[PDB]
Amino acid sequence: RLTDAVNVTLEALGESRIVDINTSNPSAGLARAALDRTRRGVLSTGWWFNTIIREVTPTPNPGQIKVPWNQLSMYGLDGTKYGERDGVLYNLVDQTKVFSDTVHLKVVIDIDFEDLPEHMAMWVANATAAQVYLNDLGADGNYKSLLGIAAEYEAMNMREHLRNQRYSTSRTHAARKIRSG
Amino acid sequence: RLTDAVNVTLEALGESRIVDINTSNPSAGLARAALDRTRRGVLSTGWWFNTIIREVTPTPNPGQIKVPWNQLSMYGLDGTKYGERDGVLYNLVDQTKVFSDTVHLKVVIDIDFEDLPEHMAMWVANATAAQVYLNDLGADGNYKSLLGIAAEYEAMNMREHLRNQRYSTSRTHAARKIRSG
Amino acid sequence: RLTDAVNVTLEALGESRIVDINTSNPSAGLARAALDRTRRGVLSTGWWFNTIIREVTPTPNPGQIKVPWNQLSMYGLDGTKYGERDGVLYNLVDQTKVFSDTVHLKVVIDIDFEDLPEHMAMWVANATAAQVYLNDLGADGNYKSLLGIAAEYEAMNMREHLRNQRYSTSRTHAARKIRSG
Amino acid sequence: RLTDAVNVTLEALGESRIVDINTSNPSAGLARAALDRTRRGVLSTGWWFNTIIREVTPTPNPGQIKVPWNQLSMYGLDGTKYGERDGVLYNLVDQTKVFSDTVHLKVVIDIDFEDLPEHMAMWVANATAAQVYLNDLGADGNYKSLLGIAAEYEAMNMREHLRNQRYSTSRTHAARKIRSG
Amino acid sequence: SWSEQVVPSGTTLISVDIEYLDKSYIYLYINNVLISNSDYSWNSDTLIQLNTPMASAGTVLLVRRTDKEYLYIMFAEGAAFIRENLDVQNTQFLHLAQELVEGRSIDGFYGDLSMNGYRITHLADGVDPKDAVNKGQLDSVSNRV
Amino acid sequence: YSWSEQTTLISVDIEYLDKSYIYLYINNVLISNSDYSWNSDTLIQLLLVRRTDKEYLYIMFAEGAAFIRENLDVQNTQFLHLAQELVEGRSIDGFYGDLSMNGYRITHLADGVDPKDAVNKGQLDSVSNR
Amino acid sequence: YSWSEQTTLISVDIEYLDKSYIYLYINNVLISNSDYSWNSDTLIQLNTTVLLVRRTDKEYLYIMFAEGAAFIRENLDVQNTQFLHLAQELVEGRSIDGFYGDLSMNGYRITHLADGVDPKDAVNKGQLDSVS
Amino acid sequence: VYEFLWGEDAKRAQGAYHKWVLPYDVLSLHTLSEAAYFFVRGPGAYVLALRVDPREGFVAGTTYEYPFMDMGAPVTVQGGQFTLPEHLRKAGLQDSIALAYYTGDDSGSELGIASISSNWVCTTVRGVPDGNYLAGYRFKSGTTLTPPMLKDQNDNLIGSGHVRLLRLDVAMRNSGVVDVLVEDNARDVDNDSEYSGVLMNSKELAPEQPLKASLSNIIIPCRTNTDTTEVTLSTSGTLEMNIMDVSYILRYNQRRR
Amino acid sequence: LIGSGHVRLLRLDVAMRNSGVVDVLVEDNARDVDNDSEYSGVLMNSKELAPE
Amino acid sequence: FEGTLQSLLQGVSQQIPRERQPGQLGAQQNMLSDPVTGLRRRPPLHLAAQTLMENPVSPDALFSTYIERGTDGRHLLINTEAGIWQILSKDATTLIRSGQ
Amino acid sequence: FEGTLQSLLQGVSQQIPRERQPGQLGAQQNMLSDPVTGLRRRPPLHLA
């Protein structure tokens, strides 16, 4: 699928698309670099495929808590700011790396470009193609059309995300429903 | 039918039509690849001829589930999110591949370009032709005309989908109608 | 009549029109291909000349139900999604080709270009001419004028379709009329 | 009269007028063909000198009906849709060519260019000239002027049609008027 | 290539959907009995009307058999080698391959068949001494012995 | 069509397109090509079964075959003869799958001698009679 | 001539008109085309016994001719090759999957029959002799 | 081969330096009042005298019906067998032996040869009828076009590596089928295919008429870099190849003046 | 010059002095056009058209 | 950007495509650059009667030269390896086989 | 402003860069100005 997106970017530039994987003379490496950067930037915000560390009780001797290597962003479930330093959990407001109690944090991980939903992959590929076209061939009507296509794919991705996470009204109406029964 | 779509794409560019698909023409394979990409991108959203509701039980003692069909998107009927890693079922939020109980899910399969409705095929072919023209000869009046034709065929496909899927007021009116009986 | 529409497309390009059938050196084959594609796309939606399969009871031994070869779109009269696979009826939501009970389906067929009403034929010819002109000579005022002519012929076709199918108010007023008598 | 229409078309282009119709001039035959096409396209809708109400009974024991006249459109007075296949009557929805009882229908016949009203002939001739000029010398101010002249003659033809066909309030007022008598 | 359906008693109109090359290529079977051409007429291209309505409900079968006597389009005797001529000539062969694949056109084999270790499933009971037999009738022999 | 069943030499009436395609069988015994001669196109000098070539096209236009009406007609005649051949059962020599008779009867099956052969009803009835 | 029977790379020696016309069977089980890719015209690489079966479609003509289209000599050859291949799989016996009439094979015996289990299946005398 | 044409004021209007290839090694050559004689190394033990009019394949309003075919020799073919002429019996070049019509309306059309035996008896393809044909060697004629360079408003060349060629349109008169190969080392593009301008339902396409088109604009698609592209047109056949004009479409960014 | 096969000629205007009637034939093999006709510039009610 | 090559009748050039004069080609083989008909395939080599002169073993050992003698001519032919001269008519017909 | 140098095959020039003829170079060493292949490195000196 990665070669397919590289070919998408090559087509956006008007060049002949490739078949062999990463063994091409033309500057298609910029396409791969832009694709990786765009994928990381887009996945930085929380989507419906992101993990959670419900409880990680640290051992008192080292005091440090390991975090997933492929993490992108972390949000503490409680009121604490968290981040990564040297691959372990870090307290931003306290500037310390040690922890004595359990931590409940929500962490956003990174996904390989062959392992993510079709809509998000197409959005990333089209955004990379638009960025590469803007860098190389300038900002003309083709760039605007590519931006519109990327926006449409982003809208489809948002539709899928809203479908997977049923964001109905079930937060304060629970009290009324409990009162009715 | 696929040869006709490729001929439409070639006509949009103004090149020579082909009579033998799977030939050695450089632009023939490009048209097929663009058609396949557009088809996979557009069928990702659920349609009447793509969505099938199926339930699969782990065949051995609770373990992995090899996902059948040529799935494009995979929504979960229950309150869990599903993925597809290494060709088997995967729980996106739980980061696990082994399931204990049967899972009910709605899967959006992929449809070959020879066996899809006429309106949808016309929409895909014209969108592919418009994209190829935009990438090759730039954005101009021809691009806008091709986009308009593709939008008209999109409207026809939407009409077909709405006609074959009866979407009436039958969600909460059942409670107000069964009581009168 | 087909040669007349091919000559319409040739006139739109400013070339000399032909008399002999499909034995011309100039690239008038694009006109025929575009005409066929446009006719199929336009006839894909249901019009006033489309057949119905009121009841087709399948034989239990094969289990498959034959569909008309020249079909374009199919809508089940009941709440079932239907389509074509290998020339027989297909269940989209069930992904099966066998049937045990009767099926009531509405099917849209394809019509030869010498066997369809004058307004629809003129609309198809003018749309094909506009598409060919956009592909070849660019998007100028001639393309806009051809699009306007095609829109006028489409309006006349809609007038004819509404004349043949009397779409008055005879759905819920039937209850009131029965109550009055 | 037809020679005068062809001369009008030639004058619009600026070529030399002809005095002998059915000559060998390349643009003379083009004008006649365009005039015939425009006439057939425009007379398809019902006018006062085209619509005749006739009833034809199957001459033999219930079988096919050979459609007379030079029909352009064929509406059915009863609740059935009619076509014209192989020169005989054809039921579009029933896909049958044999009829059991007599059929009542309103048929729109075709009128030769020598025997139609003056306003309608002028409208057809000027529309043909405008179309030929648009196809030949492109869309410019001359095209808009010719379209305006054609629209004025169209308004005159509409006035004639409305004058000869008394279209007053005599549909439901009969019930409110016969009762007062 | 063919279609089978169960129609109610008293039906005269039969609708065909098989794309035939000639009207004489369509064979009508009622209850696995061939119907003579004089007993029905073609109201239109896709409609067959029976001279006499069916007395009782039965299965209607519409086998098509392409006439493989001579080439439909003979090029040496006047064919112009144009698009539709070639299309029809190839359509004849395509149709013939279709009926051959469907398997309703082969009546017998003049040679020693070899299933190569595969069962001949769904075999009806024999009626004649020369007919083959299935495992169902072997059950009676097993029970009696 | 494909075959015809009939001391004299021979007599053929089968329409063919190459001499090598005709196979000569007498009393269900194969005869080698060197054992007979083709004196005329309609006579054979010392059961006729036809088997058209299958590996290659009769007229390969790409290879350089003459483009004429006769070649087109001969190429079409190849497929016509082959389709005629594929209906009398003289070409099919076994099925690589589960054949289904779906409620139909196999007629005129002969008694087998190899324990992996099909069985008729005559010997079944013989067993049924002790 | 139309089917081939023979751990990651699989060769394809039989000719075909399209890649999708070839079906790959592993232990008499069909594998969807999404589970493998074509490295070349004579090499199939799987994602992770081997039987290859060709089946040309018989619903549409492979090469469709159009008025005012470019023509070459090889188009007729490919069109004829379609029917030639179709007849090939017709002969090999891997295409016909049943019958709808009564076979009238005259005085010939069928060999190599698998022992049926469903009493509707045919039976060989390897079981009749055991019963007898 | 050198072609020259001197115009007014002693200005060389045309200078050509193309190359020719002959089936046999040449020993000597000399020109005459009309034709140039080539003396080649015969396959046997004698040299052959090859003559040619340098500008001979042009006919006014009638087209050249003679096949493009070196060292022709009349041959009668019966039963699919014909003996190769003695001067064509050179070992190692049997794959270059051709056969073509030279008498009827189908003159110039090539015919296939199945194989050549040791005794130099040739077997024709099954489609070849019995008649009189021409036997001789086949020469490959090809040309590589100079890539279309782009010039600005001030008639100055643009830098390499930034102008993308889209397609190449070639107009051809009275030509058969040619083979087009597009090479671009800098972008790894290698597409080889054939393009023919004979229409399907045209009067040019007839069972007996040669497969030629009076006018044909074959469009060669090559989405490569115009700085290093190498598009070549060739055909090893008995039919002509005439090129009048080559039309190109470029794609360059006008980001700055 | 522009490439061949993409420029369409519409009409040809020929100015002639003291001429009679000429025959004009238009040939185009690439488009199958063959129109043969005569064109005269003598006006109907002009002094040029007289019986003598 | 649309365009058309100015000319194709110039010969082969081994220069880089940048600094090439108009009309020059990258590589040309077996073709004739006729101005009256555009780029054309070279005409075939018609064969005259095979001379009775034996093949020269050395690749460059044959000398030929046409001599005009009135309205008729001759084709001098000399084999340098053996000195065997030969005289031919205007088209492949030996008149006097000059001795070596 | 975008541009491209007209030529590089001319020799060295010691003039100021303003009034230099097209193609002239500021300084060239051990290089060959071959028109058929552009600016190239000089060939090596084979030893007899």
Q: How many whole angstroms from its chain centre is CA C83?
A: 16
Neighbours of chain A (3+ CB pairs under 8 A): B, H
Q: What is the three-class DSSP state of F126?
A: helix
Is residue F37 within 8 Å of F45, Cβ to Cβ?
yes
Residues A13 and A25: their CA atoms lie apart, in Å, by 15
User: Most D CBs within 10 Å: which of I11, I32, I36, as the mutation test of the D interface?
Assistant: I11
Q: What is the three-class DSSP state of H103?
A: coil
The pair of three-digit structure tokens given for residue I5, joined into one six-digit string: 């096969």
Is residue K23 within 8 Å of K8, Cβ to Cβ?
yes
Q: What is the three-class DSSP state of C149?
A: helix
Q: What is the three-class DSSP state of G62?
A: coil
Is residue A50 within 8 Å of A116, Cβ to Cβ?
no
SS (H, E, C) K1-48: CCCCCCCCCCCECCCCCCCCCCCCECCCCCEEEECCCEEEECCCCCCC
Is residue H211 within 8 Å of H106, Cβ to Cβ?
no
Interface of C with G in 68-97 (CB under 8 A): 86-87
Nearest to H37 by CA among J65, J5, F7, F31: J65
Give yes or no for C140 touching D (CB within 8 A).
Answer: yes
Residues H228 and H243: their CA atoms lie apart, in Å, by 22
Q: With contacts defined as CB-CB under 8 Å, which chain J residues touch K35? A: 15, 19
Which chain E residue has its CA at the smallest distance from F94's CA? E114
Distances in whole angstroms, Cα of residue B23 to Cα of each of B3, B17, B20, H182:
11, 12, 6, 16
Surface-to-core class of residue G123, CB atoms within 10 Å of its CB (0-12 exposed, 13-18 middle, 19+ buried): buried
Tell how strand F100-104 and strand E121-123 pair up: parallel
DSSP class per residue in F10-22: -------S-GGGE
Q: Which amino acid is at C174?
A: A
Residues 6 or more apart whose CB falls under 8 angstroms from that of H64 comprise H57, H58, H108, H174, H240
Q: What are phi and psi of E90, to 5 degrees?
A: -75, -30
DSSP letter at G107?
S
Residues E94 and B99: their CA atoms lie apart, in Å, by 49
Nearest to G96 by CA among F94, E27, C63: F94
H221 with B26: Cβ contact below 8 A? yes
G47 with B20: Cβ contact below 8 A? no
Residues H23 and C102: their CA atoms lie apart, in Å, by 75
I5 with H203: Cβ contact below 8 A? no
Residues B105 and B91: their CA atoms lie apart, in Å, by 12
Residues J39 and J10: their CA atoms lie apart, in Å, by 10
Residues H22 and J36: their CA atoms lie apart, in Å, by 25
The pair of three-digit structure tokens given for residue D79, joined into one six-digit string: 């609740």
Is residue B93 within 8 Å of B81, Cβ to Cβ?
yes
Distances in whole angstroms, Cα of residue C23 to Cα of each of A47, H206, I5:
60, 11, 19
Q: With contacts defined as CB-CB under 8 Å, which chain A residues touch B140? A: 141
C13 with I8: Cβ contact below 8 A? yes
Residues B47 and C81: their CA atoms lie apart, in Å, by 10
| D and I interact (at least 3 Cβ pairs within 8 A) | yes
Looking at beta carbons, which pairs linking F54-57 to residues 24 or more positions away fall under 8 Å? F54/F82, F54/G1, F54/G84, F54/G87, F54/G88, F54/G91, F55/G1, F57/G77, F57/G80, F57/G81, F57/G84
Number of other CB atoms surrounding residue B154 within 10 Å: 18
Nearest to G126 by CA among E132, F112, E128, E124: F112
The pair of three-digit structure tokens given for residue H149, joined into one six-digit string: 């360079």
Is residue A99 within 8 Å of A65, Cβ to Cβ?
yes
Helices H, strands E: what count in chain C?
A: 5, 5
Interface of F with H in 37-76 (CB under 8 A): 58-61, 63-72, 74
Q: What angle do CA C68, C71, C72 make, to 5 degrees?
A: 165
Residues C28 and I31: their CA atoms lie apart, in Å, by 10
Rg (CA), chain D: 21
Q: Which of H171, H203, H214 sits opposite I4 (nearest CB)?
A: H171
Is residue H102 within 8 Å of H68, Cβ to Cβ?
no
Tokens 């890693």 locate to B85
Residues H82 and H115: their CA atoms lie apart, in Å, by 11
Residues B36 and E10: their CA atoms lie apart, in Å, by 50
Q: Is A45 left (phi over 0), alpha (psi -120 to 50) or beta?
A: beta
Q: Which residues of C122-161 are buried (b: 16+ CB within 10 A; e: fewer)?
A: bbbbbbbbbbbbbbebebeebbebbbebbeebbebbeebb
Q: With contacts defined as CB-CB under 8 Å, which chain I residues touch H209? A: none
Q: Which of C56, C57, C69 sits opposite E19 (nearest CB)?
A: C69
Which sign does the torsion angle of CA F17, F19, F22, F26 carry? positive
Nearest to E95 by CA among E5, E3, E13, E21: E21
Residues H66 and H102: their CA atoms lie apart, in Å, by 6
Cα of E143 to nearest chain G Cα, Å: 10
Distances in whole angstroms, Cα of residue J27 to Cα of each of F28, H217, H234, J24:
67, 22, 11, 9
D75 with C144: Cβ contact below 8 A? no
Is residue J25 within 8 Å of J8, Cβ to Cβ?
yes
Give the DSSP H or E segment for H68. Answer: none
Q: What angle do CA B94, B100, B106 make, to 5 degrees?
A: 70
Residues C82 and I27: their CA atoms lie apart, in Å, by 56
H223 with B16: Cβ contact below 8 A? no
Report chain breaks in chain H, C–N > 2.5 Å, as residues after which they occur: none
Distances in whole angstroms, Cα of residue E15 to Cα of each of A95, D91, E42, E61, E86:
83, 14, 10, 11, 29
Nearest to G105 by CA among H242, D62, E113: E113
Which residues, listed in sequence order, are joined to residue D106 by a DSSP beta bridge? D53, D75
Which residues, listed in sequence order, are joined to residue I46 by a DSSP beta bridge? none
Q: What is the three-class DSSP state of G116?
A: coil
SS (H, E, C) chain J: CEEECCCCCCCECCCCCCCCCCCCECEEECEEEECCCEEEECCCCEECCCCCCCCCCCCCCEEEEEEEECCEEEEEEEECCCCEEEEECCCCCECCCCCC
Helices D26-42 and C2-12: crossing angle, nearest 10°? 120
Q: What is the three-class DSSP state of A50?
A: coil
Q: What angle do CA E51, E56, E60 make, to 5 degrees?
A: 65
Q: What are phi and psi of H129, to 5 degrees?
A: -80, -175
DSSP class per residue in F26-65: ETTEE--GGG-EEEETTEEE--EEE----SS-SS-TTTT-
- In chain K, the N- to C-terminal Cα span, in Å, equals 52
Helices F69-85 and E83-102: crossing angle, nearest 10°? 10
Nearest to H231 by CA among H169, H138, H157, H162: H169
Residues 6 or more apart whose CB falls under 8 angstroms from that of F28 comprise F47
Q: Which of G66, G68, G69 sits opposite C24 (nearest CB)?
A: G68
The pair of three-digit structure tokens given for residue J69, joined into one six-digit string: 């003698």
Give yes or no for D75 touching C (CB within 8 A).
Answer: yes
Q: With contacts defined as CB-CB under 8 Å, which chain D residues touch I44? A: 19
Report chain breaks in chain G, C–N > 2.5 Å, as residues after which they occur: 6, 48
Residue A90: CA count within 13 A, CB half-sphere? 9
Which sign does the torsion angle of CA D160, D161, D166, D169 carry? negative
D95 with E49: Cβ contact below 8 A? no
Which chain I residue has its CA at the smallest distance from J7's CA? I1
Q: What is the three-class DSSP state of E85?
A: helix
Q: How many whole angstroms from its chain centre is CA F23?
A: 8
Residues K47 and G8: their CA atoms lie apart, in Å, by 55
SS (H, E, C) chain D: CHHHHHHHHHHHHCCCCCCCCCCCCHHHHHHHHHHHHHHHHHCCCCCCCCEEEEEECCCCCCCCCECCCCEEEEEECCCCCEEEECCEEEECCCCECCCCCCEEEEEEECCCCCCCCHHHHHHHHHHHHHHHHHHHHCCCHHHHHHHHHHHHHHHHHHHHHHHHCCCCCCCCHHHHHHCCC
Which residues, listed in sequence order, are joined to residue F118 by a DSSP beta bridge? G124
Is residue B19 within 8 Å of G64, Cβ to Cβ?
yes
H211 with F69: Cβ contact below 8 A? no
Q: Which of H169, H203, H215 sits opposite I3 (nearest CB)?
A: H169
F117 with G122: Cβ contact below 8 A? no
Cα of I24 to nearest chain C Cα, Å: 17
Q: Which amino acid is at G106?
A: N
Give yes or no for H171 touching I (CB within 8 A).
Answer: yes
Q: What angle do CA A34, A38, A42 make, to 5 degrees?
A: 175
Tell how strand J31-34 and strand G9-10 pair up: unpaired
User: Most J CBs within 10 Å: which of K8, K36, K39, K40, as the mutation test of the J interface?
Assistant: K36
Q: With contacts defined as CB-CB under 8 Å, which chain C residues touch I33? A: 16
DSSP class per residue in H185-204: GGGTEEEEEEEE---SSSTT
Which chain H residue has its CA at the smallest distance from K4's CA? H159
Residues B115 and B118: their CA atoms lie apart, in Å, by 9
| K and J interact (at least 3 Cβ pairs within 8 A) | yes
Residues K2 and H256: their CA atoms lie apart, in Å, by 6
Which residues, listed in sequence order, are joined to residue J12 by a DSSP beta bridge? J25
Cα of E51 to nearest chain D Cα, Å: 13
Tokens 């999109």 locate to B154
User: Most D CBs within 10 Å: which of E16, E42, E43, as the mutation test of the D interface?
Assistant: E43
Tokens 């956006």 locate to A12
Q: Which amino acid is at F91?
A: S
Q: With contacts defined as CB-CB under 8 Å, which chain A residues touch B44? A: 117-119, 122, 156, 160
Q: What is the dihedral of CA D63, D66, D72, D74, to 10 degrees?
A: -30
Is residue G59 within 8 Å of G24, Cβ to Cβ?
no
The pair of three-digit structure tokens given for residue F78, joined into one six-digit string: 């190849």
Nearest to B108 by CA among C95, A112, A154: C95
Q: Which amino acid is at H250?
A: L
Within chain A, where are the H helices? 2-12, 29-44, 118-136, 141-164, 173-180
Residues C25 and C127: their CA atoms lie apart, in Å, by 23
Residues K32 and K11: their CA atoms lie apart, in Å, by 10
Cα of H188 to nearest chain A Cα, Å: 6
Give yes or no for H111 touching F (CB within 8 A).
Answer: yes
Is residue H253 within 8 Å of A137, Cβ to Cβ?
yes
Give yes or no for H127 touching F (CB within 8 A).
Answer: yes
Q: How many whole angstroms from its chain centre is CA F43?
A: 19
Residues B92 and B81: their CA atoms lie apart, in Å, by 6
G124 with F118: Cβ contact below 8 A? yes
Residues I6 and H61: their CA atoms lie apart, in Å, by 23
Residues B47 and K20: their CA atoms lie apart, in Å, by 70
Give yes or no for B53 touching C (CB within 8 A).
Answer: yes
Give the DSSP H or E segment for G46. Answer: strand G43-46
G103 with E97: Cβ contact below 8 A? no
Which chain G residue has its CA at the smallest distance from B22's CA? G18
Q: What is the three-class DSSP state of B10?
A: helix
E81 with H200: Cβ contact below 8 A? no
Distances in whole angstroms, Cα of residue E22 to Cα of each of D15, E88, E92, F73, F83:
52, 11, 10, 21, 18
Is residue B19 within 8 Å of B3, Cβ to Cβ?
yes
Number of other CB atoms surrounding residue D92 within 10 Å: 22
The pair of three-digit structure tokens given for residue B41, joined into one six-digit string: 């991108």
User: Most E CBs within 10 Å: which of D97, D99, D100, as the mutation test of the E interface?
Assistant: D97
Residues A3 and G37: their CA atoms lie apart, in Å, by 14
Q: Which amino acid is at I28?
A: D
Nearest to D81 by CA among E46, C52, C75, C172: C52
